[PDB]
């Protein structure tokens, strides 16, 4: 068990103690997914209005 990398300053200290050793989509793609959902939404809205039409 040994202390390593001891740094001191007026605010405090920090060190490391080692006990034992070891053994994205595009803006084009984000826009596509967001608009594919608006079309899926506007379609279901159109199904409702055409159904209310009958």
């Amino acid at each position: 068990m040994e202390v390593i990398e001891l740094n001191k300053c007026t605010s405090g200290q920090s060190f490391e103690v080692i006990l034992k050793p070891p053994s994205d989509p595009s803006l084009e793609e984000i826009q596509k997914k967001l608009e594919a959902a608006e079309e899926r939404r506007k379609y279901q809205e159109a199904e409702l209005l055409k159904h209310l039409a009958e």
Partner: protein, 438 residues
């Protein structure tokens, strides 16, 4: 000096953001009007507190922060509350109608309409930075906005700010003090979409905070105010290395280096020092050994789980108060003899210690007592996967009947996004078993 922008999304993120920035102002001696008499360099500077505060010519220190909610009530309380003058009005962004506890509505129908404006107000802050580090994003797993909009914001931040770090402070849903039945859905959806865009995420299980307030603060029914003041104490400990002079976790990238050896396993467990009631008429001050040993008690963790049945990949001890290295090492030697602390073998069994001499700060008229020394332990342990198992089970119980799924499909989501999200969670749980179980 490399600046950090905080983003607070949804109710939980906004109200936790308030409690954090209130704490930050007290720790740095900044008044509610934004002035800081201790700051003798006026109009600017590259001090460590400037990581979180820019300075105006009038001597005013304003948070590098953006508050966004799809609904005005909560952020309206910011614009009128104690810290009106602290924030530029353009940093407090509200919609007109919230996501109705629905990820799909927060991410698609309502969020798509406000994403462009938020990004621009976010960019207005980035253009004030000489060397932007990255973002700290506060949100709930369960809320429609905190889950749906956050994931939408995380994607666009990755394209616009490709080289900047992004850390999360995430509220994990607890039935004890939750809001919605569909919070398991929102949690799984937002976690799946955000996983590949977040560099480090500190999860806070509302059940842990709630019981810590019940047990250690003797508060019968903790309020959000009670919870948020405690969370900010933990958050302040984690971010203190960014706002004060120190050698450990000085920049956001070092959080990843020290805490996250694998990018997907980026959920460190936080355990906090002593939580003592201000109302307690006589208290005995806990030694360095007593508070360091307390870091390995599940009763003090932000997420209830058993680290004895997992493996550590990293451990950080963040001290605040009267603490010297001699006492820390003596306490670690004592603890290792009596506790089940086992690391993955491709990692050295060792603790990274940071000490700030200033004892923790407490809000006047709060619930926490003033303490002479404290510590926040950040350990990356596979034991936190218990939380994923807990959540994924509740998801499975509802999805087997496709219960409530029509509310999401009705806003444009496909049923396949649900199963696509759950499969990523199943893969996340398998990764944790690979690293942690023999």
């Amino acid at each position: 000096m490399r600046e950090c922008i905080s983003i607070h999304v949804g109710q939980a993120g906004v109200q936790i953001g308030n409690a954090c920035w209130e704490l930050y102002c007290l720790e740095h001696g900044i008044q509610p009007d934004g002035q800081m008499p201790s700051d003798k360099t006026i109009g600017g500077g590259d001090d460590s507190f400037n990581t979180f505060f820019s300075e105006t010519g009038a001597g005013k220190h304003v948070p590098r922060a953006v508050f966004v909610d799809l609904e005005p009530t909560v952020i309206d309380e910011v614009r009128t509350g104690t810290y009106r003058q602290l924030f530029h009005p353009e940093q407090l962004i509200t919609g007109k109608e919230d996501a109705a506890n629905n990820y799909a509505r927060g991410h698609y129908t309502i969020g798509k309409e406000i994403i462009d404006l938020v990004l621009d107000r976010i960019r207005k802050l980035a253009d004030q930075c000489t060397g932007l580090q990255g973002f700290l994003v506060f949100h709930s797993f369960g809320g429609g906005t905190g889950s749906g909009f956050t994931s939408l914001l995380m994607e666009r931040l990755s394209v616009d700010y490709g080289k900047k770090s992004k850390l999360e402070f995430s509220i994990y849903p607890a039935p004890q003090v939750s809001t919605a039945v569909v919070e398991p859905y929102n949690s799984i959806l937002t976690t799946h979409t955000t996983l590949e865009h977040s560099d480090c995420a500190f999860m806070v299980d509302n059940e842990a905070i709630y019981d810590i307030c019940r047990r250690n603060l003797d508060i019968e029914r903790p309020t959000y105010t009670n919870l948020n003041r405690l969370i900010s104490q933990i958050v302040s400990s984690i971010t203190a290395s960014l706002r004060f002079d120190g050698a450990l976790n000085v920049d956001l990238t070092e959080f990843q280096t020290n805490l996250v050896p694998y990018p997907r396993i980026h959920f460190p467990l936080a355990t906090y020092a002593p939580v003592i009631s201000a109302e307690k008429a006589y208290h005995e001050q806990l030694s360095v050994a007593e508070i360091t040993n307390a870091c390995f008690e599940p009763a003090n963790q932000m997420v209830k789980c058993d680290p004895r049945h997992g493996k550590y990949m990293a451990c950080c001890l963040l001290y605040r108060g009267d603490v010297v290295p001699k006492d820390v090492n003596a306490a670690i030697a004592t603890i290792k003899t009596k506790r089940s602390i086992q690391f993955v073998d491709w990692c050295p069994t060792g603790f990274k210690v940071g000490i700030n001499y200033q004892p923790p700060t407490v809000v006047p008229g709060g619930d926490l007592a003033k303490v002479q020394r404290a510590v926040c332990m950040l350990s990356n342990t596979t034991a936190i996967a218990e939380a994923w198992a807990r959540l994924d089970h509740k998801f499975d119980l509802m999805y087997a009947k496709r219960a409530f799924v029509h509310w999401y499909v009705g806003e444009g989501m496909e049923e396949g996004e649900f199963s696509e999200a759950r499969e990523d969670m199943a893969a996340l749980e398998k990764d944790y078993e690979e690293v942690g179980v023999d």
